[PDB]
Structures are given as C-alpha cells and as structure tokens.
Amino acid sequence: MPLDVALKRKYYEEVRPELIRRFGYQNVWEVPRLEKVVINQGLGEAKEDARILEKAAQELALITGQKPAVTRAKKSISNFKLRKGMPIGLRVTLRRDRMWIFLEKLLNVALPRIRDFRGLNPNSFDGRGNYNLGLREQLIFPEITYDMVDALRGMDIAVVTTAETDEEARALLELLGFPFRK
Amino acid sequence: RLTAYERRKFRVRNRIKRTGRLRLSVFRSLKHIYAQIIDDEKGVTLVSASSLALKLKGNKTEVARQVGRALAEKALALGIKQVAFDRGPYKYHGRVKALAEGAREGGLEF
Amino acid sequence: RIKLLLECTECKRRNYATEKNKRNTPNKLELRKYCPWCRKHTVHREVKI
Amino acid sequence: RMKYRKQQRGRLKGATKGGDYVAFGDYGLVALEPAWITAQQIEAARVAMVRHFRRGGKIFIRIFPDKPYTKKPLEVRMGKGKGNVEGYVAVVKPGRVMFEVAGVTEEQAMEALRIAGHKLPIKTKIVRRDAYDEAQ
RNA sequence: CGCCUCCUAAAAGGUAACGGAGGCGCCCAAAGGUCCCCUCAGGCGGGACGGAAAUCCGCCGGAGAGCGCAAGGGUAGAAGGGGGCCUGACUGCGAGGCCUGCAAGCCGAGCAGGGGCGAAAGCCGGGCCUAGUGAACCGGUGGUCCCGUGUGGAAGGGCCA
RNA sequence: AAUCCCCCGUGCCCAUAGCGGCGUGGAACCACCCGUUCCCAUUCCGAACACGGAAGUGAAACGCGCCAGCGCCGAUGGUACUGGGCGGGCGACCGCCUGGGAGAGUAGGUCGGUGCGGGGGAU
C-alpha cells in the first residue's frame, strides 16, 4: 500500500525529467505534469435514497475518503424536461498526493481488472490534455465484496493537468500510467 | 477576469463607501507585504509603512505584527492626530490580522 | 383565515407590543423577542394569541 | 401575402417617406406616391410578373405584408374595441425600391411591371441600376 | 366600474377614448439583521448509471441567465448564489422635501432610550424596489388606572394598543 | 531630503486603458514557488483562503514596446428632422423664407494619459 505510494512517487518523479528534456527544452516545467484530481460518479437519480445512496457512501469512502447519505432524486429527472435545483452533487475533489498514490493504485494497479478490461480507447483526454476516461464499471473489489448487488458502476474521474496540448499530455500519462491502444 | 479582479474591486468599492476618513492599504505575502496610508483621493497619501527592513522571515507572522505596530506609531505621529481604518486582501488572522494589531498599537499608544 | 392568521406579541406580563404575522410553515412555534416599554427594552417574549 | 406569426394585433396610421432605393438585379419597380398596399394586390403583381415571364425564371421581392388593417365591425355602428383583424399589407410611401428579377432581358420585363403596378395602386416609376452603392 | 406595470403623455411633468396590452385584493416565520465567502445562462471540446437536457473535467462570455408573484425600472462596481451569528418587521421621534386643492399616500439625515452583525471605519426603526388596500360611525378585547353626574365604590365610562 | 528613471502599490478618466499576435524581466521587484506542527481554511484537498520559509524559476498571474485582424473611436463635409413665419394645392400632401441641424455613410483614429504613498533606479 504505502508501497505503491513510494511507487507513483518515483514513476513520475523520474519519468518527468526523463521525457521532460527528452523533448521539452523549455525549463523542466509542467511540460507536462499532472495536478489534483476530482472524481465524479453516476448521479443521485441513480438513487433508491437510503439504500444505493448509502452504497455510494461505502464506495466514495474506501475509494478515496468521502461516503454518501440519503437524497438522490430532487427536482427529479422526472419526465424529460422536468427538473429543478440540483441536490445531487456527489464527487471527490481531493487535491494532491493522496491523488498520486491514486494515479498509482487506480491506473497502474487496477486498470485491467474485470470483464475484458482491456483498454483500446482513442484520444483519451484530448480535451486539452487534462484527463478523460472514467470506466463504466467499478474496480470491482478495489476493496469490498457484496455490499450491494448492483451497488455501483457509473464511475468516472478527471485530473487537473498542465500537460497542455495533447501529443504532450500523451507523453505524460502515456508512459506515466499507460496509454490504452490506438 | 471580472472574477478574481472583482475579489479585488469588491473589497474595493465596499471599503470605499465606508467613510471615517482614512484607510491604510496592507498587502499580504512576504517581501511583497507593506502598507501605505490614504484618505479621500484628495490626491495625498500620509506615510509609508515598512521599507523591507527585514527582521525575521521566519515563522514570523510576527515579521508582520512588528512591521505593523511599527507603521502603527509611524503614522501615529507621522501625521499628527486622526482616526479611521483600512483595506486588507483578507480576514484578520494571519498576515493581515497582523497589520491589524500593528495598526492596533499604532492607535492604542501604550 | 388562510394559512395567514394574525397574532401579536405581549411580554412577561409587563407589557404587549403587537404586529400580525401568519400561520403557514412552523405554525405555532411562537417565542420570538421584541422589547416592550417595560424597563429599558427587555426580552418581551412575543407569543400572545 | 405573408406577415405570418406576427406578434401583435394592430398598428396605427400616418405616412411620409422612408428608405428604399438600391437595385438588386436590374429589373426594378419603384413606387413613388403611395402608402400601404394590399399584401394581396401585391401578390397580384407577383403573379402578373411570374406569368408573363415565360412562367419560370424567378423574380425577387421588395416590401412585405407588414401591417393589419381593420374595418372592424362588418358595417355596424362604431365603438368596437376597434378589434378585428382583416387586411394585411405593405407600408411603402416615398418612391420605394421594389425589386423584381427573372431574366426577361427587355421591355418584356417592362410590360411585366407595366401591368403589375399600372395595376397595383399608385403613381409610380420603374428602371434599373443607376448609381451603384458602396457598403462596408 | 380599486390598485401596479407598458404604449398613446407628442420627448418636463402630465391628459381622455366602449383606445391597446396585462397582472393583484398572496405573503416570505424566516427571501426580516449584519459579518465572512462565492459569482450567470448559454457556446464549444472531453467524459460513469449518460446518453436532445443531469454529474464532472477542460476552455469561451456589455452579464442576454437572476431577484415568490405581471410589466417596467434597475441592476452580478450582484439587490444575485452559500455559511455564521441575530432581532430595530424597535418605542419616543423627526428637520426637511416627493406629488395633492380636500384627505390621502410617499422620501428621510439626524437627537434619545435599546439593543445586534464586526474588533472595529459603520449597516439595522422588514424585505431589491413601483400593486397584497378601505374614512366615519358602531361595537370587542389586552390596558390604563383619567372621569364618575352629593361621597365612598360602580354600572358605566375618557386616551393607549 | 526634495532632479528625471526603474518600478510595488493605489488613485481620476468607462472600452484608442480590449481582444488577440511577436518580444521581452527578476539583480533588485514580485509571482508562482517549498512545506505545514503553528493562525487559520476548503460542506473534497491550505485548491482559495492560510499558516509555516533557504531554495528553483520566471512557465504561469505579470509590466513596457512593436503589431490595428476583430473589435472601440467613429470629422469635414451631406441628407433626413425641425424650432418660427409664408406660400403652392379640394387631396392624402407638396413646396418657399429664417436660426438649430444626429444617424449611418469613405476619413481616419488606438493598441491608454495620468492623480499620490512610496523600494527605491542615476555623486
């Protein structure tokens, strides 16, 4: 555990200067590093309120620190254009290091893990070189067992990077955490 | 744009309406910091706080409290006798709480 | 008569001040505050139906 | 006519001058001493032209079915909310740039207009492109 | 057939019409105080349960989203979005003005007692404002403790709320 | 002490103080920066705010200068309008005399000018 902690620490610390000058030649800047990572998941309407809301709890929890209560369908998805406020903001905006043992554990230690979990995804982030890819099925047992039949699945996170333009960002998490195929 | 700039222009305009005659403009950060006194944009500006006469960049929000109390008396007499308040890029607990107490003695005079 | 009914404040037997008010949401709950001419200001209380 | 999906019920009345002039193809019909002109009458001309022109190569446009004219009642005595919507049309008054093409190549177009408007409803004149026009 | 808003009042203001249009005769116990923070819709690009439209990431933007309620004014230099603590949505009152012939209705610095939001420079005598309104009589109730038809009291009654 | 100059602030002027394009500075500014027990802080993270300091860099916020593409400014003329007096027409309406006389429309215009405190920049 703190094992893979020291791990990401190194992966990146070195890889960084590595490609850093390999191609950069700017001034070893965020050319192209990664900072803070928010994570978001399958909106409250995915609710049952008490039940799967508390499950969202368990999960958000053991995953990175924060676990769901009972309120996930207000101003309701209702019928099509039928919705009011937005009291279903269930996400983790944790900011740094924790995040890195995470890049670790998460990408590099749980990446392929369950049903054909391959990863042959085109322009992963591409929306400015900052993230993109959230997976559509939990890291199954990134911990816990049957603590809810359907429990959870709509999973998707995002990193705040500086890997500016893509090709660059690409160098970045490509060698840093694995670039899923063509 | 309008965002952070406003953080600014807001403490601004409110501060401004405020009117008990003068305001000192503290300024957060290390060597950055320094506070100058002003009144009505008559055009004038009383005295200048602390020329970077470093006393302890250390764990010294006290580098602060000091430069402050300093400016406190500095103006205190610098400009004979008066009463008002000031700006602040933030709440009064750190750097700024500091310039505060500085001023604080500035007026307290004991 | 609607969820809008009129009450008024009176204070610890030492005065009564007035003002209308409502019925809706927290209904009865009626302490409040106010100050009578009793003493110089004073709690008052409010309630009084 | 066409003054579809309006927005209000009625206008009012006045008249005096405006801003029609240019060219837009070189087959032009310009009003001169009018006011409002029935969206219909209008279509009239439209027809006249369209038909004359060996019945095909398109003409263009000009004014619009603009306002809602009301004779209100039907013939009553007067005091209705002045309500009633009824005849819709153009509001062109100082010799206006009325623009109609086709590819007549000639006094043929001429005729087309000739009747169209001779018809329509006023003292008016016609021509082509006479002093270009420069915009930004 | 009372009131608010817009047009026509034609540029001060201000005016009919069986002239155009269109709302209100609620409340909001906390949209009432103040201190501290924040800051739109929508466009685009990238994304779990999506999947025209949530939720999150990445840019873009005289602010056209917003403010119970209609319009209009305003206006995110927020009146707007969030947190803390609290009653002044105080009594005594006001100088001096808006409009108005009547009565109306309406604007208010500042002095007093008295508190509440900051440490304070100060804001708070309801709300973001322009409609939610009704003389006079009559009578009720909570006072008060002024009057009483010889005097003591009292039916009853004067001013307050 | 009291000259201009570099500025860090902090003031009047509402877009020629804008967008954006090329450049460029840290010596000293100042920014990001380091880390967090301690002030005090994020309904998640000191992200911001904050505390706690050598460094490293000047990427990022950042200040001038060149660039007018968008945007902003937007005259001279010129017409419409019309204050007032008179005509011409049954007419809707036209026209004449005497002062005021925007708009848009080529000009061409700009990539701020400056109030004050001051580290200080040049015996």
Curated annotation (Swiss-Prot), chain A:
Gene3D superfamilies: 3.30.1440.10
InterPro entries, alphabetized: Ribosomal_uL5 (IPR002132), Ribosomal_uL5_bac-type (IPR020930), Ribosomal_uL5_C (IPR031309), Ribosomal_uL5_CS (IPR020929), Ribosomal_uL5_dom_sf (IPR022803), Ribosomal_uL5_N (IPR031310)
GO biological process, one term: translation
MF terms (GO), sorted A to Z: rRNA binding; structural constituent of ribosome; tRNA binding
GO cellular component: a single term: ribonucleoprotein complex
Presence of keyword Cytoplasm: no
Presence of keyword rRNA-binding: yes
Swiss-Prot/TrEMBL keywords: Ribonucleoprotein, Ribosomal protein, RNA-binding, rRNA-binding, tRNA-binding
Recorded family membership: Belongs to the universal ribosomal protein uL5 family.
Assembly and interaction partners: Part of the 50S ribosomal subunit; part of the 5S rRNA/uL5/uL18/bL25 (TL7) subcomplex; has also been isolated as a complex with 5S rRNA, bL25 (TL7) and DNA binding protein II. Forms a bridge to the 30S subunit in the 70S ribosome, contacting protein uS13; this bridge is straddled by the 5S rRNA. Contacts the P site tRNA.
Summary of the function given for this chain in its UniProt record: This is one of the proteins that bind and probably mediate the attachment of the 5S RNA into the large ribosomal subunit, where it forms part of the central protuberance. In the 70S ribosome it contacts protein S13 of the 30S subunit (forming bridge B1b) connecting the head of the 30S subunit to the top of the 50S subunit. The bridge itself contacts the P site tRNA and is implicated in movement during ribosome translocation.
Name of the protein: Large ribosomal subunit protein uL5
Gene name of the encoded protein: rplE
From Swiss-Prot, chain B:
InterPro entries found in the cross-reference section: Ribosomal_uL18_bac-type (IPR004389), Ribosomal_uL18_bac/euk (IPR005484)
Biological process (GO), any one: translation
Record-level Gene Ontology MF annotations: 5S rRNA binding; structural constituent of ribosome
Entry GO terms, CC: cytosolic large ribosomal subunit
SUPFAM superfamilies given in the database record: Translational machinery components
Record's keyword terms, sorted: Ribonucleoprotein, Ribosomal protein, RNA-binding, rRNA-binding
UniProt protein name: Large ribosomal subunit protein uL18
Organism field: Thermus thermophilus (strain ATCC BAA-163 / DSM 7039 / HB27)
Gene name of the encoded protein: rplR
From Swiss-Prot, chain C:
GO cellular component terms listed in the entry, alphabetical order: cytoplasm; ribonucleoprotein complex; ribosome
UniProt keyword Ribonucleoprotein present: yes
GO molecular function: structural constituent of ribosome
Keywords: Ribonucleoprotein, Ribosomal protein
GO biological process, any: translation
Pfam families in alphabetical order: Ribosomal_L33
Keyword Ribonucleoprotein (UniProt): yes
Family note: Belongs to the bacterial ribosomal protein bL33 family.
Protein name according to UniProt: Large ribosomal subunit protein bL33
Organism of origin: Thermus thermophilus (strain ATCC BAA-163 / DSM 7039 / HB27)
Curated annotation (Swiss-Prot), chain D:
Signal sequence range: none
InterPro entries per the UniProt record, alphabetical: Ribosomal_uL16, Ribosomal_uL16_bact-type, Ribosomal_uL16_dom, Ribosomal_uL16_sf
Keyword Ribosomal protein set for record: yes
GO cellular component: cytosolic large ribosomal subunit
GO biological process, one term: translation
Keywords, ordered alphabetically: Ribonucleoprotein, Ribosomal protein, RNA-binding, rRNA-binding, tRNA-binding
Cross-referenced SUPFAM superfamilies: Ribosomal protein L16p/L10e
A Pfam family reported for this protein in Swiss-Prot or TrEMBL: Ribosomal_L16
CDD domains: Ribosomal_L16_L10e
Source superkingdom: Bacteria
Keyword Lipid biosynthesis set for record: no
Gene Ontology terms, MF aspect: rRNA binding; structural constituent of ribosome; tRNA binding
Family: Belongs to the universal ribosomal protein uL16 family.
Biological function: This protein binds directly to 23S rRNA. Interacts with the A site tRNA.
Assembly behavior: Part of the 50S ribosomal subunit.
HAMAP family referenced in this protein's UniProt entry, alphabetically: Ribosomal_uL16
Name assigned to this protein: Large ribosomal subunit protein uL16
Source organism per UniProt: Thermus thermophilus (strain ATCC 27634 / DSM 579 / HB8)
Gene of this entry: rplP
